[PDB]
């Protein structure tokens, strides 16, 4: 995928945001920003330019499911790819997120390999 693609990384914990960001760097993506929750994320997406979103689920202000639903419901971002990266692993949460339009779902903890694999899976289906 285009190495200038702009990513938005969302999680309420810096450690994870940091892992994701560094991982993206390895893959060749430097246009990367961070957000700490749904609200903070929506504001930046409103700033335009974003082409991909990686997000956590449990976060104050607006959690990841809500963010996802909001992004898919907005005519201006509805197809924005959204990859869930969360510790929630119950099948019931995966269903909800998936039904809600998630482009992918990764469970924490995860390896460098797993992430890249999922990202490419999403690129592959969107022809990116
Ligand atoms: Mn969290
Ligand atoms: Xe994330």
From Swiss-Prot:
Binds 1 Mg(2+) ion per subunit. Its main location: cytoplasm. It holds the Pfam family Response_reg. The modification 4-aspartylphosphate is found at residue 56. InterPro entries: CheY-like_superfamily, Sig_transdc_resp-reg_receiver, ST_Response_Regulator. GO terms for molecular function: metal ion binding. The modification N6-acetyllysine is found at residues 91, 108. Mg(2+) binds at residues 11-12, 56, 58. Its cofactor is Mg(2+). Residues 6-123 form the Response regulatory domain. SMART domains: REC. This is Chemotaxis protein CheY.
């Amino acid at each position: 995928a285009d190495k200038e693609l702009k990513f938005l990384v969302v999680d309420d914990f810096s450690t994870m945001r940091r892992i994701v960001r560094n991982l993206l760097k390895e893959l060749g993506f430097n246009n990367v920003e961070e957000a700490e929750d749904g609200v903070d994320a929506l504001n930046k997406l409103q700033a335009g330019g974003y082409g991909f979103v990686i997000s956590d689920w449990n976060m104050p202000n607006m959690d990841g499911l809500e963010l996802l639903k909001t992004i898919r419901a907005d005519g201006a971002m509805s197809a924005l790819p959204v990859l869930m990266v969360t510790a929630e692993a119950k099948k019931e949460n995966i269903i909800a997120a998936a039904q809600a339009g998630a482009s992918g779902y990764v469970v924490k903890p995860f390896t460098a390999a797993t992430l890249e694999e999922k990202l490419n899976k999403i690129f592959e289906k969107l022809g990116m």
